[PDB]
Amino acid sequence: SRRRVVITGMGMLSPLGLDVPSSWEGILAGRSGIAPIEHMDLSAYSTRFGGSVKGFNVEEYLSAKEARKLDLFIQYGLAASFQAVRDSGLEVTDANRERIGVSMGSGIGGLTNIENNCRSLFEQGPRRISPFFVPGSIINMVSGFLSIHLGLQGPNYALTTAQTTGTHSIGMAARNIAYGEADVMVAGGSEMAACGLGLGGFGAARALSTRNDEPTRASRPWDRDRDGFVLSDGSGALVLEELEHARARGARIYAELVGFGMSGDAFHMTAPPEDGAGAARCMKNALRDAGLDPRQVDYINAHGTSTPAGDIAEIAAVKSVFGEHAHALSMSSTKSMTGHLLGAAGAVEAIFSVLALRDQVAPPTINLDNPDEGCDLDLVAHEAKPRKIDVALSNSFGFGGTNGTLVFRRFA
Amino acid sequence: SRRRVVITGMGMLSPLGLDVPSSWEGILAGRSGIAPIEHMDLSAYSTRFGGSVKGFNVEEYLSAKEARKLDLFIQYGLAASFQAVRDSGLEVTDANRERIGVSMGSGIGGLTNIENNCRSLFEQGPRRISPFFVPGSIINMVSGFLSIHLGLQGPNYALTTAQTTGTHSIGMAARNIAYGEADVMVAGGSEMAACGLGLGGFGAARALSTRNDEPTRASRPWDRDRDGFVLSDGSGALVLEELEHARARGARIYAELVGFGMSGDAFHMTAPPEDGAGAARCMKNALRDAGLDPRQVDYINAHGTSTPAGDIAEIAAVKSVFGEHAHALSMSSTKSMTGHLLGAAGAVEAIFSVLALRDQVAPPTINLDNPDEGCDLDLVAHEAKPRKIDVALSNSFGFGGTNGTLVFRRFA
Ligand SMILES: C[C@H](O)CNCc1ccc2c(c1)OCO2
């Protein structure tokens, strides 16, 4: 019968820091991690900026000889996974290695690597393709390499649900523990889609902010002057753990994961419904899953991508789910500061949601200078808001109409 | 407790046929789907053959315009999925659409699209990248497009666990129904990696059979002259359904899904341990899940890729799990005929496991002319074997040491 699940460890690479504490300080101070991109020439692109991971040293984690074989998304995933495990204090042994699994996902995976090998193929021939092209690019290799390095023999898999990946990864890993398939799961996601095909591809679809001359003000969720999402890189990993297993070993518990919802919009390949019907279904699923009155919700970490249709759909979903309580809770998009980490988005945002519970503060939506028509909720414009948070909700919505909601609460 | 899960619809594209009955007819006849790859310059490549889908007409399923938006792997997953839903007789209504979800996966995803858009990028610049590049290439768009075309609002996700994808997709879909999160799921996998990058990428790891003189003899699982796997394309989809839901509408039930096992080798990035310790834990996990003794297993559809180390590890794993019953069961590799459909391998081989139960026949391992050292099990060499089959296992063991096992049982 269904077991309870707590968070005992967290790790992160974001545009704001090379770990959780440093990233979280940036969040609470309203700092942007968005800057013109330096790792390639974007003069022929309509978008020339994003949230890069700055000064990442893979040799804090791996040998240069292994690192070279792996796409950045995998390096980022392992760094965050390693951080989360260290932060948990958990020791892998013969007694428990079979009860510890990993579900680290990505939206796009090794696009940089696949592009580079495509270039080698087209310009030089097939004999210049890396022998590591497949194990070093495909999405399940975060879960793979983590299990090899730590000796994790539990359930080993990866989700790819586009911008919903990190939320789904975390939610399903909690279901694994809930149902007895595992006692511990390392779950989240990683993304590094800032190559030509990534920036070009979102560019072709006219989905990205083109504010090349003011990159820190580009991501402006619910602002009337928003013009698309900002593309960001990084990783989030959490250690999820059966409550009694955590209690038995005296683990520090950050929070309890009480709720998980999924739904499909069945509306459009890329556009959300204007009324947020799919998001409303998903949140209601998650709150029912948690046994909650919707009035218990204090804080929502919105998807909040800074697209015209996405942002407004979310307001509608929250108003429809929470009614008059929609006016009492605080909702913010940390994408105002981090940008959109795509498949890692749900992962870093689940960490920020937990930290909102630990520190009792709503992170700000920076750049919200003129809230758009109907965007009249407490969106924590400009500045972090200290406040009572017992229950925090993290939303994600992706291409394919795929929706995810996580529900966290304080644990005593 | 836990709801029972049955199979009420199946769909398929394979190198043997454009649907299930044509593919199954090839399987039982021991026909090969392997041939030199056409309309593609493989001159500089060490492998020139594989299992292509022959004569696929996407306009039976989609308009020309919607198909132009989608990678072949997505077209193949939609084909299989529409066939499976149609095969099931299911009527989607307002009253049930929130209880019907999708989990269709891929191991490698949109390489053909990535290649063609790379061509554009390098030759002409980013502004020639297709607007539909991203949503038309990402792995969750089979689940996404299927849910939109049919109005499915239940759990909407996609696994990517390399060569284990289709096994995990079906297993986790069965969990969703068992634990009351859905009444119906469409689950499986699709793959189209018979492009330059797939053939070049795997060719660079020297993972592929190079037997160009005799493509139909290349895939020879457990044969002492095997020299690696054969790369193949296609899709499988099953309609999974809660038993009482299936009985109430009078569904035709092919078989019951009674068990799902997962495990990680925690061994190596591409190589299994020699003793198959991980495949052994996974099969034991699947049998415990089913509440079955190893002695009750009649038929195993092996992973059986035709890699030197893979085939021998699976022999060790079965001998370890099944002790004195290991010779009594029949075990065959349908990859001897289909090749390795990678992420779709577990989907089509689940379908072949279900039809082995319906038709009481173990499919052959063709090309098994000279079993290797220790390959002395009943591997159904050369020809189909009619026999009693109450319980059938389908195994998938993929890169990152990720293992999957499904247990099916006759329903009457
Ligand atoms: C780090 C580097 O970008 C990887 N190789 C790409 C690359 C390969 C071959 C080429 C080329 C470019 O221009 C002409 O022939």
Tab-separated table of C-alpha atoms in Angstrom, chain A residues 106-309:
chain	number	residue	atom	x	y	z
A	106	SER	CA	15.968	15.462	-21.075
A	107	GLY	CA	13.755	17.187	-23.708
A	108	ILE	CA	16.192	17.133	-26.681
A	109	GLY	CA	19.299	15.310	-25.283
A	110	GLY	CA	22.650	15.371	-27.076
A	111	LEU	CA	21.763	17.831	-29.894
A	112	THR	CA	25.254	19.520	-29.743
A	113	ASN	CA	26.955	16.125	-30.010
A	114	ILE	CA	24.599	14.916	-32.787
A	115	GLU	CA	25.146	18.194	-34.732
A	116	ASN	CA	28.984	17.956	-34.435
A	117	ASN	CA	28.963	14.302	-35.604
A	118	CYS	CA	26.536	15.305	-38.428
A	119	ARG	CA	29.109	18.012	-39.500
A	120	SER	CA	31.960	15.352	-39.400
A	121	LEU	CA	29.739	12.947	-41.446
A	122	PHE	CA	28.826	15.542	-44.123
A	123	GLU	CA	32.228	17.238	-44.513
A	124	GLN	CA	34.584	14.257	-43.922
A	125	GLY	CA	32.580	10.966	-44.095
A	126	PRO	CA	31.160	8.307	-41.745
A	127	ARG	CA	34.649	7.209	-40.526
A	128	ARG	CA	34.978	10.532	-38.621
A	129	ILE	CA	31.842	9.768	-36.430
A	130	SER	CA	32.888	9.256	-32.732
A	131	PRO	CA	32.693	5.629	-31.525
A	132	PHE	CA	30.971	7.279	-28.438
A	133	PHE	CA	28.288	9.086	-30.592
A	134	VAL	CA	25.386	6.800	-29.362
A	135	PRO	CA	26.264	6.166	-25.664
A	136	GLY	CA	27.395	9.852	-25.398
A	137	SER	CA	24.240	11.489	-26.948
A	138	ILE	CA	21.051	9.388	-26.175
A	139	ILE	CA	18.826	10.601	-23.338
A	140	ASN	CA	18.870	7.524	-21.022
A	141	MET	CA	22.676	7.809	-20.489
A	142	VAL	CA	22.361	10.196	-17.497
A	143	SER	CA	20.525	7.322	-15.685
A	144	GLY	CA	23.029	4.847	-17.199
A	145	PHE	CA	26.308	6.596	-16.275
A	146	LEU	CA	24.960	7.543	-12.801
A	147	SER	CA	24.081	3.874	-12.046
A	148	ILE	CA	27.561	2.711	-13.323
A	149	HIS	CA	29.440	5.372	-11.203
A	150	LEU	CA	27.394	4.833	-7.946
A	151	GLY	CA	26.360	1.107	-8.263
A	152	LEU	CA	22.564	1.835	-8.421
A	153	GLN	CA	20.791	-1.387	-9.488
A	154	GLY	CA	17.171	-0.201	-8.911
A	155	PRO	CA	14.741	0.929	-11.667
A	156	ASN	CA	16.802	2.698	-14.332
A	157	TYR	CA	14.984	4.834	-16.942
A	158	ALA	CA	14.513	8.248	-18.528
A	159	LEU	CA	11.436	10.331	-19.572
A	160	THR	CA	11.431	12.702	-22.529
A	161	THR	CA	8.270	14.858	-22.347
A	162	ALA	CA	9.738	18.098	-23.728
A	163	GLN	CA	9.380	21.091	-21.321
A	164	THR	CA	7.527	18.799	-18.796
A	165	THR	CA	10.384	16.272	-18.510
A	166	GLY	CA	11.762	17.278	-15.046
A	167	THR	CA	8.322	17.351	-13.373
A	168	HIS	CA	7.247	13.972	-14.877
A	169	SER	CA	10.685	12.442	-14.038
A	170	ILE	CA	10.295	13.523	-10.387
A	171	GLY	CA	6.561	12.549	-10.171
A	172	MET	CA	6.969	9.019	-11.661
A	173	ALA	CA	10.120	8.377	-9.474
A	174	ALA	CA	7.872	9.221	-6.422
A	175	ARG	CA	5.261	6.720	-7.768
A	176	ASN	CA	8.104	4.116	-7.961
A	177	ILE	CA	8.801	4.584	-4.214
A	178	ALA	CA	5.110	5.022	-3.275
A	179	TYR	CA	4.306	1.595	-4.875
A	180	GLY	CA	7.364	-0.302	-3.416
A	181	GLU	CA	9.375	-0.678	-6.722
A	182	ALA	CA	12.289	1.261	-5.018
A	183	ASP	CA	13.049	2.982	-1.663
A	184	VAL	CA	15.320	5.674	-3.200
A	185	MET	CA	15.274	7.423	-6.604
A	186	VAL	CA	17.576	10.121	-8.042
A	187	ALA	CA	15.211	12.025	-10.373
A	188	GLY	CA	15.125	15.252	-12.410
A	189	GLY	CA	16.447	16.363	-15.779
A	190	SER	CA	19.169	18.112	-17.748
A	191	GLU	CA	19.289	20.112	-20.944
A	192	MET	CA	21.900	21.788	-23.175
A	193	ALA	CA	20.085	22.693	-26.438
A	194	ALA	CA	22.144	25.903	-27.160
A	195	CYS	CA	23.620	24.677	-30.471
A	196	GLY	CA	22.747	25.934	-34.016
A	197	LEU	CA	19.880	23.415	-34.451
A	198	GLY	CA	18.426	24.325	-31.001
A	199	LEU	CA	18.560	28.128	-31.298
A	200	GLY	CA	17.857	27.924	-35.060
A	201	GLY	CA	14.993	25.422	-34.509
A	202	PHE	CA	13.118	27.397	-31.803
A	203	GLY	CA	14.069	30.450	-33.973
A	204	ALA	CA	12.367	28.966	-37.086
A	205	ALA	CA	9.201	28.508	-34.919
A	206	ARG	CA	9.420	32.157	-33.741
A	207	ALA	CA	9.082	30.814	-30.082
A	208	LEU	CA	12.171	32.716	-28.647
A	209	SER	CA	12.473	36.323	-27.346
A	210	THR	CA	14.501	38.320	-29.923
A	211	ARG	CA	15.487	41.018	-27.332
A	212	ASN	CA	19.204	40.691	-28.285
A	213	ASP	CA	19.923	44.245	-27.005
A	214	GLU	CA	18.601	43.677	-23.428
A	215	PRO	CA	18.938	39.927	-22.631
A	216	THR	CA	18.356	40.253	-18.812
A	217	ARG	CA	14.907	41.892	-19.507
A	218	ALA	CA	13.874	39.368	-22.301
A	219	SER	CA	12.167	36.788	-19.946
A	220	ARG	CA	9.163	38.750	-18.546
A	221	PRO	CA	6.387	36.304	-17.623
A	222	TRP	CA	2.859	37.967	-17.723
A	223	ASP	CA	4.444	41.306	-18.782
A	224	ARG	CA	2.528	42.962	-21.693
A	225	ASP	CA	5.868	43.327	-23.643
A	226	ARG	CA	6.880	39.569	-23.510
A	227	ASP	CA	7.869	38.097	-26.968
A	228	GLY	CA	8.759	34.388	-26.306
A	229	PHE	CA	10.826	32.201	-23.981
A	230	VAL	CA	14.553	32.439	-23.262
A	231	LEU	CA	16.586	29.230	-23.853
A	232	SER	CA	18.639	28.098	-20.808
A	233	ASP	CA	20.924	25.154	-19.948
A	234	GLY	CA	21.524	23.183	-16.773
A	235	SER	CA	20.242	20.381	-14.538
A	236	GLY	CA	18.278	19.623	-11.332
A	237	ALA	CA	18.369	16.352	-9.361
A	238	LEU	CA	16.533	15.431	-6.121
A	239	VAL	CA	16.927	12.338	-3.905
A	240	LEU	CA	13.369	10.973	-3.313
A	241	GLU	CA	13.144	8.478	-0.413
A	242	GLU	CA	10.483	6.415	1.394
A	243	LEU	CA	9.704	8.369	4.625
A	244	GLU	CA	10.419	5.371	6.951
A	245	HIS	CA	13.740	4.588	5.102
A	246	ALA	CA	14.672	8.298	5.590
A	247	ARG	CA	13.589	8.176	9.292
A	248	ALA	CA	15.501	4.888	9.921
A	249	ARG	CA	18.836	6.450	8.697
A	250	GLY	CA	18.216	9.889	10.407
A	251	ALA	CA	18.140	11.720	7.006
A	252	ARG	CA	17.590	15.497	6.927
A	253	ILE	CA	14.178	15.850	5.188
A	254	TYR	CA	13.663	19.067	3.162
A	255	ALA	CA	9.955	18.393	2.391
A	256	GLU	CA	7.383	15.712	1.537
A	257	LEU	CA	6.171	15.133	-2.056
A	258	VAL	CA	2.388	14.601	-1.430
A	259	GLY	CA	0.957	15.105	-4.940
A	260	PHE	CA	1.538	14.352	-8.620
A	261	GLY	CA	-0.741	15.095	-11.541
A	262	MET	CA	-0.431	14.505	-15.245
A	263	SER	CA	-2.954	15.250	-17.969
A	264	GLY	CA	-2.883	15.812	-21.756
A	265	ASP	CA	-4.472	18.902	-23.344
A	266	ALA	CA	-5.199	16.939	-26.560
A	267	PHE	CA	-5.388	20.516	-28.032
A	268	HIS	CA	-2.304	21.447	-30.201
A	269	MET	CA	1.260	20.159	-30.951
A	270	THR	CA	2.834	23.371	-29.479
A	271	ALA	CA	0.133	25.881	-28.347
A	272	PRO	CA	-1.692	25.599	-24.970
A	273	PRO	CA	-5.486	26.171	-24.884
A	274	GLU	CA	-6.208	29.898	-24.019
A	275	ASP	CA	-8.441	28.787	-21.016
A	276	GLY	CA	-5.705	26.503	-19.529
A	277	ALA	CA	-8.208	23.522	-19.402
A	278	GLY	CA	-5.388	20.863	-19.517
A	279	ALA	CA	-3.313	22.625	-16.826
A	280	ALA	CA	-6.514	22.914	-14.680
A	281	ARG	CA	-7.185	19.130	-15.034
A	282	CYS	CA	-3.504	18.418	-14.112
A	283	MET	CA	-3.473	20.655	-10.959
A	284	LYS	CA	-6.871	19.231	-9.796
A	285	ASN	CA	-5.455	15.679	-10.311
A	286	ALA	CA	-2.362	16.640	-8.234
A	287	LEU	CA	-4.409	18.295	-5.392
A	288	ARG	CA	-6.817	15.296	-5.206
A	289	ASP	CA	-3.704	12.984	-5.234
A	290	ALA	CA	-2.410	15.006	-2.219
A	291	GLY	CA	-5.798	14.848	-0.288
A	292	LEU	CA	-5.780	18.710	-0.142
A	293	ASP	CA	-8.349	21.517	-0.031
A	294	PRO	CA	-7.114	23.885	-2.838
A	295	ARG	CA	-7.184	26.727	-0.203
A	296	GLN	CA	-4.115	24.980	1.452
A	297	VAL	CA	-1.958	26.065	-1.556
A	298	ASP	CA	0.336	28.995	-0.465
A	299	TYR	CA	2.879	29.153	-3.360
A	300	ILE	CA	2.814	28.169	-7.051
A	301	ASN	CA	6.092	28.038	-9.055
A	302	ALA	CA	4.460	28.633	-12.445
A	303	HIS	CA	5.667	27.217	-15.755
A	304	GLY	CA	5.649	30.972	-16.674
A	305	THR	CA	7.709	30.782	-19.964
A	306	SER	CA	7.172	34.464	-21.149
A	307	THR	CA	5.160	33.405	-24.262
A	308	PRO	CA	1.956	35.375	-24.963
A	309	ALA	CA	-0.404	32.341	-24.937
